[PDB]
Design a protein around this ligand. Structure first.
Ligand SMILES: Nc1nc2c(c(=O)[nH]1)N[C@@H](/C(S)=C(/S)[C@H](O)COP(=O)(O)OP(=O)(O)OC[C@H]1O[C@@H](n3cnc4c(=O)[nH]c(N)nc43)[C@H](O)[C@@H]1O)C=N2
Ligand SMILES: Nc1nc2c(c(=O)[nH]1)N[C@H]1C(S)=C(S)[C@@H](COP(=O)(O)OP(=O)(O)OC[C@H]3O[C@@H](n4cnc5c(=O)[nH]c(N)nc54)[C@H](O)[C@@H]3O)O[C@H]1N2
Ligand code: SF4
Ligand code: SF4
Ligand code: SF4
Ligand code: SF4
Ligand code: F3S
Ligand code: F3S
Ligand code: F3S
Ligand code: F3S
Ligand SMILES: [Mo+6]
Lengths: 509, 207, 414, 207, 509
């Protein structure tokens, strides 16, 4: 039993509007440099589709995540330590730039400088940001499949259509589409950390954010294959890999991530989750992959349980973090209401960015239909998005937890309609799904009204703990180049001293 | 009582204490000096002065008083302002350690000698408190005191009046007050500067 | 020249002459004469009440603008009325025993036309008399545990109020101010926060250390007893005054102040850059907030959270010791209440038989307050029912505030 | 270096508290065993201001505090528990926190305006009002101002510009202070009456 | 004729309240590091006094500024190039740490950790920030003389009392004091730039801010002596010198400096001044030092003059800068109303931070006095601060320009009083000082009301001009350590590339 904390995230796909605002803000702040222009730490994909990079969910092809060997031990799908090292001279599974898209720009200046007497109206043609050469045509982009862009037979190659008779969905009347925004899952059992030969990737103890040390990374580019979500992008210029940093500079002071605060649909929630680090391997190595979801819930600890609280304090968790954990919207959605589910738990990484499945228009039928258990509102069985597709995406193929989430959302709607339209109390739907009026009202508070203070409950990462914040406050930022940052040993060849430190020791004790 | 701005205070106590109408009243004699002056001589001249405690520039009361920025822009700790005439009379030079005391207690600090302070008065700006840069007292043999170590509460009967229209109680509306400017103290240059901390880093101010 | 210019200006502008005054004048013993002097100048020139003119007294930040909205919260008036307010100068003069060293006599302050024989006694005697006449508040109030009075009243076959008045007249129950050193009439637990009482405002610092704290002190003079002076006629006297009265001193601060250095327990509080709150002042008309830039560092907590937690622990620790109790609370005659019309033509002391002991007129109001000790935390964390049952008000006026409570149920939840 | 990071308790008190709890399962009775013992009580009271602070925990201090409060209220009375906090206007809820807890349990809420001697009893006497004054912006509407015993640039710093700026509108200003105070630097005339005798000058002017 | 622009500053000493807020904010932002803890880029001094460092105005002692040789040529008082180099092994005029003050801190922790059973109340004693040793006593500080702190005979050593019978000022009734806040003057003919052997100090072309290149400075510490205002402070730890940077990071986007925006008394004004750089040497080398003030005014150009405007555009001054120059409060106070004067023009540096002299209470007299030319308000002749003292400080001893400034301020007051009190128009005082009603009303607008937009009229430094702002916007701030910043040549031994640059060249032209 070793308690650690992390700010998890929940995205309500039912409220998702697939606008990509989250992607643009992240891009502007973190990846507008040459080398990562093609990398979208946060990217939104329209489903059905193969995504970015193409077919990233196909682990047989990309070799991401973990496998559970016959002896019960975990091993990266990429191979054990020796197998992985044997692939270092040329990663055989590495995604190529074309699996993402060839980054491009346009010759806008031609519009300004076109010479007098041009035979035709000047135009701005595409040019490659990789070679600087003219591109005859743009054939791919990071969001090429947006809103079912492409023939169904192409989009339907979607890994999540596995075990589903998808023919019926190629019919106009049965058309369906949803949005899947995603970033790094900042896993409890990250496959990236395990597949980096240099040990440059690590999970921060205090807030669970997973980072690639830009000093220590040696550019072995094996981690890219290791990540089953393909959320690590090689910086082709620096020769090192980069990934979503969960906006730690903001999180550290209690602010939401950029993609969370800028989410226009108001579908992202941030809240602390306390977990038992000592149970990570046991949970991730459970025999049946359909048990990974529940096994992970079992690693999450009850923040209102004095036993957990006292253990947390003993393990160094700050009081403000424990407090935040007690009013975590993420804990309520994943643990209490069972509305949020992990993304591909079968990869065995114990992801920390979860999703509430989306509702959808009722399916095509013979007639206009009849009043169901929910009156004029939909019954879970009538939704047009095949539940098996959602289960392949969130619960390793088990439709049970997906149906529960969807039914509970619809139940809340039924209950609230009786209240706001009929002015009556009708808990029939809630009782059918095991929800109390109090739970439905709280669900409504967080999901419908969704006040800012309720969507984001991020505590400080307390940078003052175990460090020296005073000298840092006084001297951080003066980047003159003292050459003494980044090492604990004081000796340095350039005979310098840290600008933000105190060299003259107190002699009065 | 009259509903108008009241110039006349007709309450029994107001009348009998001589304040039915405003009148001039000289500073009161706290009798805090004559019983102790010269009783614990350190060899240096002592003199009685009016002890004023106007509010300081290097803190808001005692808040910020320990703040290094304020201590650096000020005089690095507890100080008392003296006129040049009074300081010279007492053989006190600017920044000399001095001790101020009376029947109520004693305080230690460094002098700030200035022409802008009129003879007869001293000003220890309000609150520099008791945690920074204070040596032991030669009067008490304890850590030096603070500006309120030389003051004492003395209530005025007219401020106890109640049950009389405008003169009726209210939290913070009426009641006795903590006046303090009438105070007088004995001032002198310190001789031994002992810090009472076992550091063996004590000084002696000569003559 | 200046008196003339000042008046001429006021005449020409219809009162636009102003006097900015402060502690330079207000901290003298005769501050009232200093002020009435300036005030008369302004009144004679019709400057009070005209923009650009008047008495501009500036000292501390005393103007909390949303007064009647804050008062019920601060003193739990939404749950119980009244609270126990006390005027501190008399409180410290008494409990830190500075009266035991008084050098100033009332006699030397009397008008030459006053009957000296009618004003004998120590300055503290005047305070005790003021207290029993309902002029000033008391603390502690009575010489007997006020939670036990209702019980005794029941056994006597009379309501607590009548029983208290009868006991006071007879002397079976006495004002605590009469015997401040008997061992039961002094404060024992003191919370200090947002204050450096022992390093800043505490006049008579060495007296507080000796009598309140029980530590070494630097007092240099002798007390009345040692000087063989005249002992008070309203207060008991003992040559060796009771020392170390406070059993527990708890201070909340973000820096280790002088007060913290002398406390028994120091609680780390959040700085102004680590908590939410509001601030107003006499100087300008804006209300703005204190906000948490980052969660309080280390183990610090806001004052609100510190007391909420103490209220929570108190509520569980008091079980079996304190339950639903009945408290007898004295309350002085209040300005801005009909009772302010107490004694119209003169001063009558009921203890001297000059009049009957009439609570709320010739003595303090005697109120009954029910306290649910186990429910302290639940009450602390909720807006009480008195706002809806009784209403809200201040400065002599009251109003219905039901619509506001309805709004608050939606904003704060229930 | 002077930031308070953890709840602290005097070592002597902590030692006795923990030993008491080892013989008394109920904390109220543990407190009783300490406070009712003259030797024990005296052991930690005389340690006040003499070092020995040790790190405690919120749980420990909260229990001791609650237990002490219950014991005191039960055996002596709620008004034997008190709290001192001033000027709620600077942090309304922060003041309310302790005042609310105390008021619910019957503890005494101590005043401050009178205690600090900021209350001008002459105000209740003349107007039946604690204190109500014009805002600093209103100084700008005045054509003749006397700064009397008020060190504006130093003690009213953020508002001082209204005073310096109104002079450009033709307003005459006069400083009345015994010393050459900062305020004098801003005025057209400096009058320096003997400190404490101002009422005499005001009377003559009124005359 | 070569036009350049700079944001000058004017401090109205008449509104100065000597609060030091300006000093604290600057300190917190720029000099809280070990090495410069004793340095106050902005410092406020009470006069009469010797200041910080002690007696900095005594050039015979400190050797700052320029001298005009017999042949009419300018030379640093420190010596010509050879003379200066001959002093490099040990600067003989260098101010020592004690000339400033020995920086100190206190042992606050003793208050927390004092052991049980201490014989006396614990206390926090002073300790040196230079040696870490216990200090027996603090004997000096950067503001030791605040509010006439010290015996008159000591304070009166003030250089500005030269040629003045100062005895009368030692009398209580004649006491006077004023405040002099100051920072670097960012001169047109800086003595610092001229006295640095490495050429590490320079004046920025676009905004005239003077800086010490932290890369190029070699720590020759000669510049410190060169500056007659002693506004360059040696960083004893880094071994390099630092100085007020006029908050260029803020100025660059059009914001006021920190000390300007945080000035509580609202006495600081910021406005553009256009100057003819080609006339700098001619002006600074004028024979009579009492002519330096006017000679500098002659270097300032009229921003509303189309001749100047067209020349400015030709010389590269941005349109927004020219526009700002046309509504510059600094230009109005220095050029139009003649209220602002330079600080010690006799140093011959052509300072760019000017001051409006302060008014003061009337002097001691036999009686209460009589109505003067200004009625109940003061006449310039009655002010208690000796005008000769102010002239020694601002006009090389010439009282004429000081009297004009003071009289004009008093005239505005007389005119406004007639207006606001008597409800009449009385321009008698204005006519006597050569001011029109319009000028008096504008003076009032800027000096009395002083709206924020009127106090600071700072244009952008236009960082996009002659540079590449696009790649910079996209990659600035990622301080991973590319080792390619600071040089124009692309070759670098570590075989790296700039993070905020584009390496892949366009091949489509
Ligand atoms: N002889 C003489 N005696 C006089 C005076 C005089 O002129 N002469 N002046 C009076 C007057 S006018 C005043 S206003 C009092 O000194 C004010 O004293 P106080 O202790 O409240 O302020 P101070 O600033 O010292 O106390 C503030 C303390 O509170 C801490 N603090 C500040 N904010 C908070 C907060 O939000 N929460 C908590 N828990 N603590 C906080 C602060 O660190 C300091 O220790 C008084 N006596
Ligand atoms: N910087 C700073 N500002 C503060 C405070 C602080 O501690 N520091 N505290 C605030 C509070 S709570 C208060 S109460 C005020 C107090 O501030 P003020 O009301 O300004 O009070 P004082 O500082 O006591 O007196 C002001 C000046 O009057 C002069 N003076 C002294 N004695 C006399 C006298 O007998 N007659 C006359 N005519 N003048 C005299 C002195 O020059 C003195 O500096 O400041 C408030 N603002
Ligand atoms: S989702 Fe993030 S933490 Fe998890 S394996 Fe991929 S890069 Fe690592
Ligand atoms: S958490 Fe921050 S870095 Fe990660 S995807 Fe969102 S915006 Fe980008
Ligand atoms: S004031 Fe500034 S620019 Fe002028 S000489 Fe000194 S450091 Fe150089
Ligand atoms: S301009 Fe900036 S760097 Fe210079 S003194 Fe002001 S605040 Fe400091
Ligand atoms: S494998 Fe490791 S070395 Fe860098 S490229 Fe990936 S983090
Ligand atoms: S797609 Fe739009 S709805 Fe939010 S998750 Fe991204 S901003
Ligand atoms: S002389 Fe030049 S080398 Fe540096 S220390 Fe001064 S800028
Ligand atoms: S001293 Fe104060 S008035 Fe302005 S120039 Fe500095 S902030
Ligand atoms: Mo005050």
């Amino acid at each position: 039993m070793k308690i650690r904390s992390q700010v998890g995230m929940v995205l309500n796909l039912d409220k998702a509007i697939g606008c990509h605002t989250c992607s643009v803000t992240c891009k502007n702040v973190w990846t507008s440099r040459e080398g990562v222009e093609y990398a979208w730490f946060n990217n939104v994909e329209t489903k059905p589709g193969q995504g970015f990079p193409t077919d990233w969910e196909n682990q047989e092809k990309y070799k991401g995540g973990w496998i559970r060997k016959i002896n019960g031990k975990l091993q990266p799908r990429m191979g054990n330590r020796a197998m992985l090292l044997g692939k270092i001279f040329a990663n055989p599974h590495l995604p190529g730039i074309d699996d993402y898209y060839e980054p491009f720009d346009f010759d806008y200046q031609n519009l300004h400088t076109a010479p007098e007497g041009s035979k035709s109206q000047p135009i701005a043609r595409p040019r490659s940001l990789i070679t600087g050469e003219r591109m005859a045509k743009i054939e791919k982009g990071p969001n090429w499949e947006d809103d079912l862009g492409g023939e169904f037979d192409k989009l339907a190659k979607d890994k999540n259509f596995d075990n589903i008779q998808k023919a019926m969905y190629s019919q106009f009347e049965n058309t369906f589409m949803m949005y899947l925004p995603r970033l790094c899952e900042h896993c409890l059992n990250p496959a990236c950390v395990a597949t980096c030969p240099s040990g440059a990737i690590y999970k921060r103890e205090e807030d669970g954010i997973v980072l690639i040390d830009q000093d220590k990374c040696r550019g072995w580019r094996m981690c890219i294959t290791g990540c089953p979500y393909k959320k690590i992008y090689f910086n082709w210029k620096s020769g090192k890999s980069e990934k979503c940093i969960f906006c730690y500079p903001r999180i550290e002071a209690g602010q939401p991530t950029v993609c969370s605060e800028t989410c226009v649909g108001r579908i992202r929630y941030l809240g602390v989750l306390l977990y038992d680090a000592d149970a990570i391997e046991r949970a991730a190595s459970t025999e049946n992959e359909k048990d990974l979801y529940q096994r992970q819930l079992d690693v999450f600890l009850d923040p209102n349980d004095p036993k957990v609280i006292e253990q947390a304090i003993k393990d160094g968790i700050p009081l403000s973090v424990i407090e935040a954990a007690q009013q975590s919207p993420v804990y309520k959605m994943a643990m209490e209401w069972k509305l949020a589910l992990p993304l591909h738990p079968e990869y065995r990484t114990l992801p920390m960015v979860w999703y509430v499945p989306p509702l959808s228009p009722i399916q095509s039928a013979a007639d206009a239909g009849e009043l169901g258990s929910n009156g004029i509102l939909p019954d879970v069985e009538s939704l047009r998005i095949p539940v098996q597709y959602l289960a392949n995406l969130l619960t390793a193929g088990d439709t049970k937890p997906v149906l529960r989430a969807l039914k509970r959302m619809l139940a809340m709607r039924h209950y609230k309609r009786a209240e706001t339209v009929d002015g009556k109390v009708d808990t029939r739907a809630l009782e059918e799904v095991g929800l109390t009026e109090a739970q439905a009202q709280e669900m409504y508070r967080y999901l419908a009204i969704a006040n800012y203070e309720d969507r984001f409950v991020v505590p400080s990462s307390h940078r003052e703990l175990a460090r020296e914040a005073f000298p840092e406050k006084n001297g951080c930022g003066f980047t003159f180049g003292d050459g003494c940052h980044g090492s604990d040993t004081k000796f340095n060849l350039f005979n310098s001293r840290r600008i933000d430190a105190i060299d003259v020791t107190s002699k009065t004790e | 009582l009259s509903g108008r701005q009241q110039l006349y205070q007709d309450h029994q106590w107001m009348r009998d204490f001589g304040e039915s109408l405003l009148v001039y009243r000289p500073p009161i004699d706290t009798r805090s000096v004559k019983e102790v002056i010269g009783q614990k001589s350190n060899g240096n001249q002592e003199k009685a002065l009016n002890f004023l405690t106007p509010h300081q520039k290097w803190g808001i009361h005692s808040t910020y008083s320990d703040n290094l920025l304020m201590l650096t822009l000020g005089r690095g700790g507890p100080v008392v302002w003296l006129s040049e005439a009074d300081a010279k009379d007492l053989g006190i030079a600017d920044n000399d350690w001095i001790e101020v005391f009376n029947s109520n207690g004693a305080l230690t600090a460094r002098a700030v000698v200035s022409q802008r302070v009129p003879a007869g008065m001293t000003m220890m700006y309000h609150a520099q408190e008791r945690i920074v840069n204070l040596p032991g007292s030669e009067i008490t043999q304890q850590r030096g005191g603070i500006h309120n170590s030389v003051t004492r509460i003395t209530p005025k009967p007219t401020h106890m009046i109640g049950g009389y229209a405008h003169l009726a109680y209210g939290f913070n509306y009426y009641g006795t007050v903590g006046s303090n400017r009438d105070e007088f103290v004995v001032v002198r240059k310190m001789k031994n500067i002992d810090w009472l901390d076992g550091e063996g880093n004590d000084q002696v101010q000569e003559s | 020249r200046i008196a003339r210019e000042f008046a001429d200006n006021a005449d020409k502008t219809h009162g636009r002459s102003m006097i900015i005054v402060g502690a330079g004048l207000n901290h003298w013993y005769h501050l009232d004469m200093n002020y009435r002097g300036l005030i008369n100048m302004l009144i004679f020139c019709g400057c009070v009440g005209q923009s650009g003119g008047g008495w501009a007294h500036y000292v501390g930040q005393e103007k909390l603008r949303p007064q009647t909205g804050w008062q019920p919260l601060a003193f739990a008036l939404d749950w119980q009325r009244p609270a126990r307010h006390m005027n501190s100068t008399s409180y410290f003069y008494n409990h830190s025993s500075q009266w035991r060293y008084e050098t100033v006599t009332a006699e030397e302050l009397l008008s030459p036309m006053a009957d000296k024989s009618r004003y004998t006694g120590h300055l503290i005697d005047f305070n005790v008399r003021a207290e029993r006449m309902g002029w000033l508040p008391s603390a502690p109030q009575l010489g007997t545990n006020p939670l036990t009075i209702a019980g005794e009243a029941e056994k006597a076959g009379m309501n607590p109020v009548d029983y208290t008045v009868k006991s006071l007249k007879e002397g079976s129950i006495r004002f605590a101010a009469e015997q401040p050193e008997n061992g039961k009439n002094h404060p024992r637990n003191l919370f200090i926060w947002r204050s450096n009482l022992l390093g800043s405002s505490g006049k008579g610092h060495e007296f507080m250390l000796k009598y309140l704290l029980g530590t070494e002190h630097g007092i240099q003079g002798k007390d009345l007893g040692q000087q063989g002076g005249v002992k008070p006629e309203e207060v008991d006297w003992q040559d060796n005054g009771l020392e170390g009265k406070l059993d527990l001193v708890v201070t909340l601060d973000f820096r280790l102040s002088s007060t913290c250095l002398y406390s028994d327990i120091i609680l780390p509080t959040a700085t102004w850059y680590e908590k939410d709150d509001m601030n107003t002042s006499d100087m300008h008309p804006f209300i703005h907030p204190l906000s948490a830039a980052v969660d309080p560092a280390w183990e610090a907590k806001s004052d609100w959270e510190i007391y909420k937690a103490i209220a929570k622990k108190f509520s569980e620790v008091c079980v079996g010791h304190l339950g639903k109790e009945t408290d007898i609370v004295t309350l002085p005659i209040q300005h801005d209440s009909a009772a302010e019309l107490a004694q119209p033509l003169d001063v009558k002391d009921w203890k001297k038989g000059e009049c009957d002991l009439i609570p709320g007129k010739t003595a303090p109001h005697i109120m009954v307050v029910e306290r649910d000790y186990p429910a302290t935390y639940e009450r602390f964390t909720s807006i009480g029912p008195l706002m809806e049952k009784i209403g809200n008000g201040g400065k002599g006026i009251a109003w219905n505030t039901q619509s506001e409570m309805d709004l608050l149920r939606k904003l704060n939840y229930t | 270096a002077n930031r308070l990071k953890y709840p602290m308790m005097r070592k002597r008190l902590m030692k006795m508290w923990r030993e008491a709890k080892a013989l008394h399962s109920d904390p109220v009775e543990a407190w009783a065993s300490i406070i009712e013992d003259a030797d024990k009580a005296k052991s930690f009271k005389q340690a006040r201001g003499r070092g020995g602070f040790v790190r405690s925990s919120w749980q420990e201090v909260n229990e001791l505090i609650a237990a002490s409060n219950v014991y005191t209220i039960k055996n002596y009375g709620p008004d034997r528990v008190a709290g001192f906090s001033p000027i709620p206007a600077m942090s309304m809820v922060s003041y309310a926190s302790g005042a609310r807890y105390l008021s619910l349990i019957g503890g005494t809420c101590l005043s401050f305006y009178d205690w600090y001697c900021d209350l001008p009893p002459a105000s209740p006497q003349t107007w039946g009002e604690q204190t109500d004054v014009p805002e600093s912006a209103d100084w700008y509407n005045s054509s003749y101002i006397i700064a009397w015993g008020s060190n504006v640039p130093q003690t009213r710093t953020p508002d001082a510009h209204f005073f310096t700026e109104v002079r450009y509108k033709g307003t005459k200003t006069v400083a009345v202070t015994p010393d050459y105070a900062e305020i004098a630097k801003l005025c057209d005339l400096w009058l320096a009456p003997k400190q404490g005798t101002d009422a005499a000058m005001a009377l003559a002017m009124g005359h």
